Amino acid sequence: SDVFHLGLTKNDLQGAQLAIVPGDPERVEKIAALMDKPVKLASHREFTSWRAELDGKAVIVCSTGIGGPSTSIAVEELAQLGIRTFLRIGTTGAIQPHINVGDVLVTTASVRLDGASLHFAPMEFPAVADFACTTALVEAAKSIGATTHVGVTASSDTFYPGQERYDTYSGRVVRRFKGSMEEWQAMGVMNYEMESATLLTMCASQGLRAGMVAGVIVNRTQQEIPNAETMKQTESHAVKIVVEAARRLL
Amino acid sequence: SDVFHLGLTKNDLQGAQLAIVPGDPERVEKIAALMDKPVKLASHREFTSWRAELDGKAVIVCSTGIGGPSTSIAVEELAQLGIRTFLRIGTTGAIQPHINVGDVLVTTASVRLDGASLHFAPMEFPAVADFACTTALVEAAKSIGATTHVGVTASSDTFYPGQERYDTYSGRVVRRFKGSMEEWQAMGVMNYEMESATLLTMCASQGLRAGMVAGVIVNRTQQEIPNAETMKQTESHAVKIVVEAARRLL
Amino acid sequence: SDVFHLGLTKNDLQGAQLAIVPGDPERVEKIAALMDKPVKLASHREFTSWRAELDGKAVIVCSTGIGGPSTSIAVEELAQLGIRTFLRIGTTGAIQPHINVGDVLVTTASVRLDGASLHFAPMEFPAVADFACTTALVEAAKSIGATTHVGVTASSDTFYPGQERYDTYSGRVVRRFKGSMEEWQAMGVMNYEMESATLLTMCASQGLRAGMVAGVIVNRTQQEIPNAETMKQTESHAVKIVVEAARRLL
Amino acid sequence: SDVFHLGLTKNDLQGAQLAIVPGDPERVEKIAALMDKPVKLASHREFTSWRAELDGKAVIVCSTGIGGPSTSIAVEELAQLGIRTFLRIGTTGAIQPHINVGDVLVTTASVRLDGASLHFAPMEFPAVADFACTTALVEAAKSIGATTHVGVTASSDTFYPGQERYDTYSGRVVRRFKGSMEEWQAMGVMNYEMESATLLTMCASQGLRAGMVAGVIVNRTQQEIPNAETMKQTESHAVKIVVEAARRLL
Amino acid sequence: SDVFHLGLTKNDLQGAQLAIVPGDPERVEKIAALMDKPVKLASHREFTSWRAELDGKAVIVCSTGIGGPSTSIAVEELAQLGIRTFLRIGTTGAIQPHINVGDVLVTTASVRLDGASLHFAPMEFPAVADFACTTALVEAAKSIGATTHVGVTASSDTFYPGQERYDTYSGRVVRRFKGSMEEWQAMGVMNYEMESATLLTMCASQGLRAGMVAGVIVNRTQQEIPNAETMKQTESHAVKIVVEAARRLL
Amino acid sequence: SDVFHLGLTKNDLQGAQLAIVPGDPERVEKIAALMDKPVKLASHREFTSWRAELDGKAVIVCSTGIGGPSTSIAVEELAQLGIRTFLRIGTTGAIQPHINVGDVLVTTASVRLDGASLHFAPMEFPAVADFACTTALVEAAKSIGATTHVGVTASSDTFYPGQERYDTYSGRVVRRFKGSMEEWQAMGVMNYEMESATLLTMCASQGLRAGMVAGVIVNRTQQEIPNAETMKQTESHAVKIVVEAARRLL
């Protein structure tokens, strides 16, 4: 085609400028089952892309995969095929008690705890979402009436220490993070994830717009445990949400 | 007695929730004035606050001073008196060729090249604008008919080495601070204010709604003679946007 | 004239190279009054100059404002107007148990807790006060019989988080400044303050003779009463010492 | 399952305690095809794991993915199930002119040019490899006669954008990582990679041994388009080399 | 006569390419004492060096003194004079309970808690020992039959704070070094010393092999009462190791 | 005895509470030559300890060694034995063209370009000299009417690889030391050297009066090289200045 690790050409999109990029590519297919006339574009490494329409428009849903080292690849190669709006939808677990599993999270900006974003702009520069993609994500959630949360997200690079988890092998998080989470709550940040730091900033630093929505799948605070049975919320909600939000900014 | 700097008391606030924090008091009342029952409360160093009303509510108009260190005081002496919303109004300049003098720039967040922000949250945390205050300042520039620009702002502690200008003889500049403009320009930053850095961050890290609207009085980009008419005209419009923006946040 | 910022020119300055610069604008006149034939000069921002004369040579007390970015402008313009000597006088919080309210403090060098300092010199570079001024000032100290102390001051860009105050809105302190006071105290630092660093640095780095003197208005240790107008006899002291001191340097 | 990402249980390894962690899964399946009793255990996300035998020993050959974020999860979730030693292998290029295709680069320690590493240890701590591991690797290339080079590898978070080189689209070519590739070379570095630094640091600091043998399938400094077959060849030797390293290491 | 500090010239090493560099100049004769045709070359300051031979090969036995600024001097001087391989021997204080006195520690790459090393390579770069030199060291401590431990060593620029020692005058360590011991031990670092980082660093970044072995003199984590004469046999072990290991390379 | 490195006991100091900290052991005696009833106490590695008595008061003179690491031990161990004041006297190169070899300079504070200081106080903490100790030196030079220059100095960790000397092996530098000394001219720094940084910092932060005199035995930048005829006179200028100074601190 022209890219590399995505193997989609330049016509596979047919004037596609938006892209609902999710984490696991297991989701990319079900995300498009929500829209119309899709197509399994490609699927190379962990970059599974589809192609669906909407309101007479052409948008694609490409999976980005764990962390920005990969994330940038997708954003990189997709944004050069044409996409100028990157809508991210994934799962997560929040750090604040006031957030009930099954609440959606629209994120204005994320706490950069990664070293990849630094490859696009200084640590001074913010990993802030796009207003258009942000209002179009809080109205979307409100449209279905979901108890949405807008704030900031702590975008770490590790699933264990950057998120201060002690239920691990060593059972010890490095000094810089010994207490990070208790600091994150006091500052109001909503949860933890690992791809927004890259996306937010690499988009915000080059004529690209983007936003992030996520569904609280679990939550490392609320005592009583959920139910997997009711973990499908990502479907009728977040997934629905992103498809709807994308509708708007189409 | 009371508040060490601002010098007020809760009684003066009269249960006020909001507060328009401009720079100088020379134009602090001009905001108040546009409100109902404007009443000068206190005025000490450069901490000059009034008090009016909006839709039966009470608003405060305290000035901040120069640089984030000064503001940090108002925004803290203030918040203790009750206020939880801080809208900041002020005129500004532009780095982008496609931005004009009548335009209004709504800061989503700002690159934190300031200094007092780090007193509140590591340079990793985002200096992002609270959705409401971000959205509210858009509603206005659209209800009055003004052209608005969303985006990121540069927030340094210098009046010259940070806005592309060097003629104040000595005035050294570390290895970094040099040609920075050309950088941000490619990154999308629009203006070079100096306060929002602490405003956004300090409030963000401490659970507070806050936004910042700025009328672009001038713009270096072109070699066009900048008249004085609009340098006053667009301001009033910038005063109308916040004022029209405070009405919603009450 | 040649300055609209501070509003003056060399011609205005009477042609004198020395400016006692305080942070409070309501003290400028108050110090120039103890000088000779002082004439009100201007009042733009919190920067308010008051020309005068001492022992046969002109002097221009000019308020510098709160915070190093405030003082940057201050010192910066006064300097390209003529001044080659600066003597800061103000209110300060003492950390040490034995430093008493009313006592006078002379700053040799200070811990850098600002940002403006960096818009002038790397942090490996010292925030050191001019020996001559340190000497002139310390000398003038005993010239009245004040209980003086000499040493490192801690210059924070924030009154609360930077000087580790917890009785604020949120009540927490970024880990960076958490424990600090203990560490400063142990490290010998004798007082908190927010302007000397930008000063001593901006001057030190280039060719300028800056100096620092303050008076304990509050002691962040003892549990007694901070009196009523405990912000007067102190100014009486220091103003004298900064006037006696400068008088010598001139 | 017993983990949250790999999809394996602390029972699908049967002692294992050793694993080989490469980029893509396409390799971990053929990697295992070299040891006896291949048994594909899972494939959840970028983590595809196989079980095999070697002199009656249980061994895991799970893939890491892209970047330390992914790799961190594997090495972490593995170490939990028993793996106490992680051996890495990868294809690569070399910046050193004298280094040619088909050579093996056993790495002792890598230049922590990443942010992931930081979640496990300070920048002053070395990203160093285990002694037995670097030996079992070096010795196994000896019992193969492959031009081996032992030393330090570079590992940041990029492969085209935000790097130093010039070729993507646009103009911004980073700052901190500009014209640095030169120093990395005269620093004696060999290859450029992106997952080591984490592997070495998250193992070197958490009581877990790890090694790394890679292959030179291409050389930039060397003006010559490599060979497709040499790469099938080169790949092969690294495979035997790492499997043979894993062999003695039990 | 030549350089200054060392007190040598090229024709005093006699083609020697290896230098054994211990700290104590009182201990140079004891090491050269075990080789053929020993000869004293210079004694200026702390830089004491003897010239020897092994298997018919002239080997320089030079000192470095206390600290790395001086260590650079040494290493830097020698290399200029021919030496391309430095064998550093020392004594030390182990921080791991499992490690007792009389044992032998081989340093793979040490923590750069030093500073002079930054004058050679970015902190990112690893203070890695030369592989070869390490092997010879480890197989040397075994041939003599010595309880050995190989791994990470911590190199501090100070002997009191740097190694979190509190039995000092001030009885106070800085934040960067408070509770840093549990840190180092938990991370797995085996000991503390003061020069490794500068050697391992200026050599690895400058095409020079280098190795270090040390003799346990104290155990930071110790509880049993140290026996009778605890030193005499301690300090001589690594002497025959360093010399033996020195053979294997030559 | 009571001290580990120096090897002395409290009685050996004989109530002494002040010490002259030179660089090498040749000087420690020439200094003790002037003072009344000098006695050699010890000489372990680089620290040669001597005792004297100025005006009837026990004065200690001990060597510190090359680089900060070494200094810190002599200092601390001295302070453990009852010394509160440290007079530094040595010889140095000048970066200023209005300054010449044969001149004496006092360092009010230094440009922390070292690594050992950082283990006493953050890089924000200033390297200033105790007023009393630095005042009894600029005035103890008037007793000799010599070209006295007093400002800050630049304490490095290495000679040329820490200041940039186009002639050595490393060539330029790892992008930092590519003209700093030229920056320091602009900064106003008068001379270049090493220990002071650590010396001031560790004393300034621990409650120990500290000072520093030195003369130019070479016009460092201004192409020069010392000699016996002159070099002695200069070393006398300082040896006396530092003994005369030391007299007044008792």
Which tokens go with D236?
A: 């092969």
Question: Between the CA of residue B98 and those of A85, B95, B188, B219, F116, what are the distances in Å?
Answer: 20, 9, 11, 10, 51
Which tokens go with D205?
A: 């600091």
* Burial class, C27, CB count within 10 angstroms (exposed 0-12 / middle 13-18 / buried 19+): buried
Contacts of D183 in chain F (CB under 8 A): 174-175
DSSP string, F89-143: EEEEEE--TT--TT-EEEEEEE---SSSGGGTS-TTS--BPPHHHHHHHHSTTGG
Using CA atoms, how far apart are residues B16 and F165, in angstroms rounded to an integer? 64
Alpha-carbon gap: E171 to the closest alpha carbon of chain C (Å): 10
Which residues of A are part of the catalytic machinery?
5, 77, 165, 220
H or E segment and range at residue A131: helix A131-143
CB atoms within 10 A of CB F82: 17
Judge whether E67 and F67 are in contact, CB under 8 Å: yes
Choosing among E158, E170, E198, which should be mutated to test the F contact, i.e. which has the most F CBs within 10 A? E158
Q: Is F37 helix (H, G, I), strand (E, B) or coil?
A: coil
Q: In this structure, what are the phi and psi dihedrals at residue C78, rounded to the nearest 5 degrees?
A: -50, -40
Judge whether D235 and D73 are in contact, CB under 8 Å: no
Alpha-carbon gap: D162 to the closest alpha carbon of chain B (Å): 13
Using CA atoms, how far apart are residues D231 and D217, in angstroms rounded to an integer? 5
Judge whether C56 and C35 are in contact, CB under 8 Å: no
Active site (annotated) includes residue D149? no
Q: What is the amino acid identity at position E12? A: D
H or E segment and range at residue E87: strand E85-94
Which tokens go with E213?
A: 């072995």
Q: Would strands C148-156 and E60-62 be described as parallel, antiparallel, or unpaired?
A: unpaired
Domain ranges of chain D: 1-250
Which alpha helices (DSSP H) does chain B contain, by range? Answer: 10-13, 29-33, 67-81, 131-143, 180-187, 196-204, 229-246
Contacts of B120 in chain C (CB under 8 A): 158, 161, 174
The full length of chain A comes to 250
Q: Using alpha carbons, select from B133, B152, B5, B2 the residue that is nearest to residue B71.
A: B5
Q: Is D102 helix (H, G, I), strand (E, B) or coil?
A: coil
**CB half-sphere exposure, C230, CA atoms < 13 A:** 18
Q: In this structure, what are the phi and psi dihedrals at residue E130, rounded to the nearest 5 degrees?
A: -70, 135
For E172, name the nearest residue in chain C, comparing CA atoms only.
C186
Buried-state track D201-212, b at ≥16 Cβ within 10 A, e below 16: bbbbbbebbbbb
Q: Is B157 helix (H, G, I), strand (E, B) or coil?
A: coil
CB atoms within 10 A of CB D248: 15
Using CA atoms, how far apart are residues A152 and B13, in angstroms rounded to an integer? 30
Using an 8 Å CB-CB cutoff, list residues of chain E that contact chain C. 170, 172, 174-175
Using CA atoms, how far apart are residues E107 and E90, in angstroms rounded to an integer? 11
Judge whether A24 and A217 are in contact, CB under 8 Å: no
Judge whether D37 and D53 are in contact, CB under 8 Å: yes
Which tokens go with F57?
A: 């008061």
Q: Would strands F104-110 and F213-216 be described as parallel, antiparallel, or unpaired?
A: antiparallel
What sign for the dihedral angle of Cα D104, D108, D112, D116?
positive
Which tokens go with F80?
A: 């453990």
Using CA atoms, how far apart are residues F87 and C10, in angstroms rounded to an integer? 44
Out of D27, D46, D77, D237, the active site residue is D77
H or E segment and range at residue A243: helix A240-248
Q: Could you say which of 3.40.50.1580, 3.90.1640.10, 3.40.50.700, 3.90.180.10 is the CATH number of the domain covering D1-250?
A: 3.40.50.1580
Which residues of B are part of the catalytic machinery?
5, 77, 165, 220
Give the helix, strand, coil percentages of chain B, each rounded to 5. 30, 20, 50
Active site (annotated) includes residue D237? no
H or E segment and range at residue E193: strand E191-193
Which tokens go with D70?
A: 């992914």
Q: In this structure, what are the phi and psi dihedrals at residue B121, rounded to the nearest 5 degrees?
A: -160, 130
Out of C127, C131, C206, whose CB is closest to F126? Answer: C127
Q: What is the DSSP secondary structure assignment for residue C165, as one 8-state letter?
A: -
* Burial class, D123, CB count within 10 angstroms (exposed 0-12 / middle 13-18 / buried 19+): middle
Give the helix, strand, coil percentages of chain E, each rounded to 5. 30, 20, 45
Q: Using alpha carbons, select from B27, B200, B187 the residue that is nearest to residue B106.
A: B200
Alpha-carbon gap: E242 to the closest alpha carbon of chain D (Å): 18
For D164, name the nearest residue in chain A, comparing CA atoms only.
A119
CB atoms within 10 A of CB A225: 9
DSSP string, B43-90: E-SS-EE----BTTB-EE-B---SHHHHHHHHHHHHHHHT--EEEEEE
Alpha-carbon gap: A189 to the closest alpha carbon of chain C (Å): 14
Out of F44, F165, F247, F248, the active site residue is F165
Using CA atoms, how far apart are residues E72 and F221, in angstroms rounded to an integer? 22
Q: What is the DSSP secondary structure assignment for residue C129, as one 8-state letter?
A: P
Using CA atoms, how far apart are residues F18 and F209, in angstroms rounded to an integer? 9
Contacts of F134 in chain C (CB under 8 A): 131
Using CA atoms, how far apart are residues A188 and F80, in angstroms rounded to an integer? 48
Contacts of B68 in chain C (CB under 8 A): 67, 69, 115, 157
H or E segment and range at residue F71: helix F68-80
Judge whether D29 and D50 are in contact, CB under 8 Å: yes
Contacts of C176 in chain B (CB under 8 A): 118-119, 122
E strand intervals along A95-231: 104-112, 149-155, 191-193, 209-219
Q: What is the DSSP secondary structure assignment for residue B25, as one 8-state letter?
A: G
Question: Maximum Cα–Cα distance for chain D, whole Å?
Answer: 56
Using CA atoms, how far apart are residues B182 and D175, in angstroms rounded to an integer? 12
Instruction: With CB atoms and an 8 Å threshold, state whether C126 touches F128.
Output: yes
Which residues of C are part of the catalytic machinery?
5, 77, 165, 220
The full length of chain B comes to 250
Question: Between the CA of residue C71 and those of C25, C116, C241, what are the distances in Å?
Answer: 12, 9, 21
Using an 8 Å CB-CB cutoff, list residues of chain D that contact chain E. 106, 108-113, 121-131, 134-135, 138, 150-152, 183, 187-188, 204-207
Out of F46, F76, F77, F195, the active site residue is F77
Chains E and B contact (Cβ–Cβ under 8 Å for 3 or more pairs):
no
Question: Between the CA of residue B53 and those of B36, B250, D67, what are the distances in Å?
Answer: 5, 10, 55
Using CA atoms, how far apart are residues B137 and B197, in angstroms rounded to an integer? 18
Residue with tokens 């040749």: F26
Contacts of E124 in chain D (CB under 8 A): 111-113, 123
Q: F89 has which bridge partners?
A: F213
Q: What is the amino acid identity at position D41? A: L
Report the neighbours of C using a cutoff of 3 or more CB pairs below 8 angstroms: A, B, E, F
Alpha-carbon gap: B37 to the closest alpha carbon of chain C (Å): 27
Which tokens go with D97?
A: 């002119």
Question: Between the CA of residue D84 and those of B37, B141, D16, D241, F122, what are the distances in Å?
Answer: 73, 61, 9, 20, 38
Choosing among C30, C43, C48, C66, which should be mutated to test the B contact, i.e. which has the most B CBs within 10 A? C66
Using CA atoms, how far apart are residues F43 and B128, in angstroms rounded to an integer? 62
Active site (annotated) includes residue E98? no
Q: What is the DSSP secondary structure assignment for residue E121, as one 8-state letter?
A: S
Judge whether E80 and E5 are in contact, CB under 8 Å: no
Report the neighbours of F using a cutoff of 3 or more CB pairs below 8 angstroms: C, D, E
Residues 6+ apart with CB under 8 A from B70: B46, B64, C46, C65, C66, C67, C70
E strand intervals along A186-234: 191-193, 209-219
Judge whether F107 and F148 are in contact, CB under 8 Å: no
Contacts of F116 in chain E (CB under 8 A): 115, 157-158, 162
Which tokens go with D161?
A: 């954008």
Using CA atoms, how far apart are residues F6 and F70, in angstroms rounded to an integer? 11
Contacts of C134 in chain F (CB under 8 A): 131
Instruction: With CB atoms and an 8 Å threshold, state whether B186 touches D175.
Output: no
Judge whether E61 and E20 are in contact, CB under 8 Å: yes
For B205, name the nearest residue in chain A, comparing CA atoms only.
A187
DSSP string, D7-60: ---TTSSTT--EEE--S-HHHHHHHHTTSEEEEE---BTTB-EEEEEETTEEEE
Which alpha helices (DSSP H) does chain E contain, by range? Answer: 28-32, 68-80, 131-143, 180-187, 196-204, 234-249
The full length of chain F comes to 250
Which tokens go with C89?
A: 């006088």
